[PDB]
Design a protein around this ligand. Structure first.
Ligand SMILES: Cc1cc(-c2noc(C(F)(F)F)n2)ccc1OCCCc1cc(C(=O)N(C)C)no1
Lengths: 296, 247, 39, 247, 39, 247, 39, 39, 39
């Protein structure tokens, strides 16, 4: 039954029990129900007024923490002789929450999640030392982060006319300013994001497995607004996401084996325990061996 | 205008801060909420669900073999069958459980735990066991006459296949700590041991070896504090296809 | 302090203390009684 | 003074922010408002207006030839006449319409669409057609017996020159997405096909070939979300005379 | 929050939900009735 | 937005500032309070507790020998026995006391002090002493006839082993200062002297030398102002094992 | 000025003027009277 | 928003709409009437 | 605007218009009358 719980339950003192037909310590695991044996029925207890709060385990508190989701370094310089794969004073990122394991594991403790996302962008710069290993100071550059939704065109160069951002939301921020911050609303086409999706994204058979197309977000495009300086710099952009106004459903067994890919739940496990495919828990000599036995 | 001055901490980015921030998409209407079964609002609801302990965490056990303990008929009385370390922070049988996994995101804990064991022998198998919880202070008991001095339940196999051993919260301090010093007075919980009470007795046609499955969960007096990054997951490199997101 | 016009801009909501653990601990049609044998 | 501290995001320029700002011209009196016909307050009013589809988007059709579909008398029964892709994000017959143009400024959409066809043959021309909407999942139907299993209207030419085929909002999700993967389960709407129901029959003095004009509009259950830059316009250089503004 | 003296300095006004699509969808002198033939 | 301007002092870190600051651990529930004996809410409660003076601060006295003053039978009358400097800021008998230690965290002080002396001779020992407080202005009196002109108590040894000499707050100014110029008119308190009133007379079997223990404390009219770093503790290098905290 | 949600974030509390020096100056079962000999 | 103690620190005053153009357009002792000859 | 807890932190007080110049201009026991000779 639903109830308001703010503190851990109190204990009531209990007396000796010898009652025919009453066996509170016996249970039937087969029904799928967790044992309902109370401490007062297993041992003789005292009265305890428990004042311990439970607020820190609230789902909102558990998940509403800013966590790294994206980290991209690119060179800020004249890119006239750069390769096609190089980030030429800008980068684009297909938004996902599966690249950094600390946040991914916590999110994957649930099947469905509904939340708004607070986005914080932190920027750092360093002078390039390759050949030009001389320090002149760090420039206070202006950056543009543009949110490109599904079906919109992404910029192809630092001076692309797509950056005019007629309708796209863009934020211009300086390195010397505090990190830029914006809130993205819950934008799923369903009532909640599908943390896990046991299905295929297309009406043919070649679509990607395990990614619900309803949760597609889009692209984050970040460029340096300043034209390049005579010397080269390395710019690192870090994006943090904090869920808020959270609703969660259907908790799941936690991830045990190391993650392999951001596209699937493929698993290999460590070479040996702990967290190996054949042994999650570290081994002990035998079931009668106390690993940290206290002697004297 | 309003005269103001900036305090220390102005301009900082605290990952646990709680403020409003500018909406990037004005006038956006989120999809209407729909009822979905299995909503969870406090993580303590998850830790209250029973999950299997890895009691048989030995090199000889592979896969789900590590999730059951085999017991056979013995020819000596009062024999020890197995013990269970009670440290959640260390790598032990309780670590990969709902309670253990959720708790290892925190640093402090309090409240009672419950261990439930299901006997999975044949209907014709019979036996009695004693399950003991020894509060900390000494060595893990190795004999029944010593183990039975602590909290214990004598379990008679029968129609009800499962028994529950309550590990009551017996602690000097309000909370304990998930600290790597397993012998610290702020962390050690004690021991759980299982002895034969009479014997496992089965007829010739039944299997002479029977298995128990041990489950653990927290009672509703359980609580946790001081959120921390779980040591159960980590990465030393970027995951495969992570780079492709930037292509 | 929320002067933004869109409600989703607000700070976090940490005041929902409602619980129903029986959804996961006792999802059986026939509720079990204390002391009485389950089977 | 008032103690204060700066939050993350302070000093940023968010193009979608909504704040007051300093008036550059104090005490300026704007010209008094005057009633003007045709005021529009919500863009959904525009998408509700019928506009012509470019059904005949083929290399042989030039100019407004692409805005009509020619139908002639056939000597075989139940023949397919044309089909219409229902993807607004892709470049198809629905893209250059009021609904299509306005919607392509957004990413998500929901609600029913209506297709209206006007027969522009002579008064003496007669015929019956069947217009079918097939919910997604399979291939576009190529035969009448398959197409007629879906939503359809049988159209009899007559004094009322136009018929309406309703494309009801039949979707698993609340919204669909204008995404470049036309085969995605979050984007595909299905197909619209047109078959002869009986035949086009005209006398010798009437034109043996008659044209239909197809229109499309959204019903008042239509909605859009997640504003985006329209991919229908772009520039690779400055427009002519733009530099002269700085001279 | 608008402490400026000139009203046009204020933030945007996104609260005008009035609509009249018939200005563009049905600008005919004789209104049409549901089901009845138009002509 | 709100027009604002930054005042002088904005962004400074004042070690004595008093502001709220961002909680690093949201929703943390501190351990419930429990009654503990001996709560102290104002440091003036500590200075009101008697503590021993180091009257015998001489090279010949080692350890706790410095905490007692020996008195013997004399063959001349009205002899001086000891005096006590009354400067708390200077290094004297009052420095390592509760009142002295706590006060040396402050710069200004006011109020009365009380000196209590316990006679620790044998039951058979008898004698009378005069304890005098001389307000400042001149030299410390060296004769009884001069010392007895000031505030004094004549103490008769007996069943009540202890006598109290009140040093009343006699000051031109509201407060005095703990300044290194002991002869300043804002700091000097005067002198305390002890003379034989009659003599120490003991029988042959009793010890011919008897000890007094002097205690000092402030009355409840005592107060302190202008917190300062105590000169009683300092370090010229890092303490041992301090570096190990970073390893 | 405390707009934080957690109470421990507040500024210092310097308004507790309650005292009980007798806890340290007179922790005896039998209270002593003024003037009367203690022993 | 004026938290200064001296009144002359305040912002501008743009609310004095009083007019008397006759001081400059008709500074004659004998007021003129509409239509009637001035002389 | 003073959010500090110590009163001496407040801004200046320029509202004490009390005067008594006779303390310096006429500190005589016998007050002098207008017109009448002082001596
Ligand atoms: C990281 C980010 C950045 C921006 C952005 N950066 O700049 C701008 C600009 F241009 F306005 F300035 N917008 C926008 C949105 C972003 O992500 C949205 C998180 C939503 C989500 C879904 C799931 C999921 O699928 N689940 C839980 C199964 N997880 O999270």
């Amino acid at each position: 039954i639903e109830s308001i719980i703010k503190t851990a339950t109190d204990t009531v003192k209990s007396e000796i029990n010898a009652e025919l037909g009453v066996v509170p310590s016996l249970n039937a695991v087969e029904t799928g129900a967790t044992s309902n044996t109370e401490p007062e029925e297993a041992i003789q207890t005292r009265t305890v007024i428990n004042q311990h709060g439970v607020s820190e385990t609230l789902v909102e508190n558990f998940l509403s923490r800013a966590a790294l989701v994206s980290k991209r370094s690119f060179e800020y310089k004249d890119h006239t002789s750069s390769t096609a794969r190089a980030d030429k004073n800008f980068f684009k990122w297909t938004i996902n929450t599966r690249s950094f394991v600390q946040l991914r594991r916590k999110l994957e403790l649930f099947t469905y999640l509904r939340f708004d996302a607070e986005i914080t962008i932190l920027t750092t710069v360093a002078v390039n030392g390759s050949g030009n290993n001389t320090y002149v100071g760090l420039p206070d550059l202006t950056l543009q982060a543009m949110f490109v939704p599904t079906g919109a065109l992404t910029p192809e160069k630092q001076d692309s006319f797509h950056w005019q951002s007629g309708s796209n939301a863009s934020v211009f921020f300086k390195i010397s300013d505090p990190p830029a911050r914006i809130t993205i609303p819950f934008m799923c086409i369903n009532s909640a994001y599908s943390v896990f999706y046991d299905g295929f994204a297309g009406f043919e058979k070649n679509g990607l497995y395990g990614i619900n197309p309803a949760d597609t977000i889009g692209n984050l495009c970040v460029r340096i607004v300043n034209e390049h300086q005579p010397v080269g710099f390395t710019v690192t952009v870090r994006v943090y996401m904090k869920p808020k106004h959270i609703k969660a459903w259907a908790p799941r067994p936690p991830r045990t084996l190391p993650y392999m890919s951001i596209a699937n739940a493929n698993y290999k496990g460590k070479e040996r325990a702990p967290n190996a495919l054949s042994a999650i828990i570290g081994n002990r000599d035998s079931v009668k061996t106390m690993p940290h036995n206290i002697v004297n | 205008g309003v005269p103001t001055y900036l305090l220390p901490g102005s301009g900082q980015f605290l990952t646990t801060d709680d403020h409003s921030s500018a909406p990037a998409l004005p006038c956006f209407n989120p999809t209407p909420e729909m009822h979905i079964p299995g909503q969870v609002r406090n993580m303590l609801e998850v830790v209250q669900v029973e999950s299997m302990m890895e009691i048989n965490n030995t090199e000889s056990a592979v896969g789900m073999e590590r999730l059951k303990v085999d017991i056979s008929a013995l020819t000596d009385v009062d024999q020890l069958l197995f013990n269970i370390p009670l440290d959640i922070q260390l790598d032990g049988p309780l670590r990969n459980t709902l309670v253990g996994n959720i708790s290892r995101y925190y640093t402090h804990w309090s409240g009672s735990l419950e261990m439930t064991f299901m006997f999975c022998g044949s209907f014709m198998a019979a036996g009695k066991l004693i399950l003991c919880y020894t509060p900390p202070g000494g060595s893990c008991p190795t004999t029944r006459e010593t183990a039975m001095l602590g909290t214990h339940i004598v379990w008679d196999f029968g129609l009800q296949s499962s028994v529950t051993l309550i590990i009551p919260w017996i602690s000097g301090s309000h909370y304990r700590m998930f600290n790597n010093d397993a012998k610290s007075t702020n962390a050690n919980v004690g021991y759980v041991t299982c002895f034969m009470q009479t014997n496992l007795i089965v007829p010739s046609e039944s299997s002479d070896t029977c298995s128990l499955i041990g489950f653990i969960a927290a009672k509703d007096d359980f609580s946790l504090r001081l959120m921390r990054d779980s040591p159960d997951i980590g990465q030393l490199d970027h995951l495969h296809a992570a780079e492709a997101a930037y292509q | 302090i929320n002067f933004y016009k869109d409600s989703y801009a607000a700070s976090a909501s940490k005041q929902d203390f409602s619980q129903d653990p029986s959804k996961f601990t006792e999802p059986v049609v026939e509720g079990l009684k204390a002391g009485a044998p389950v089977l």
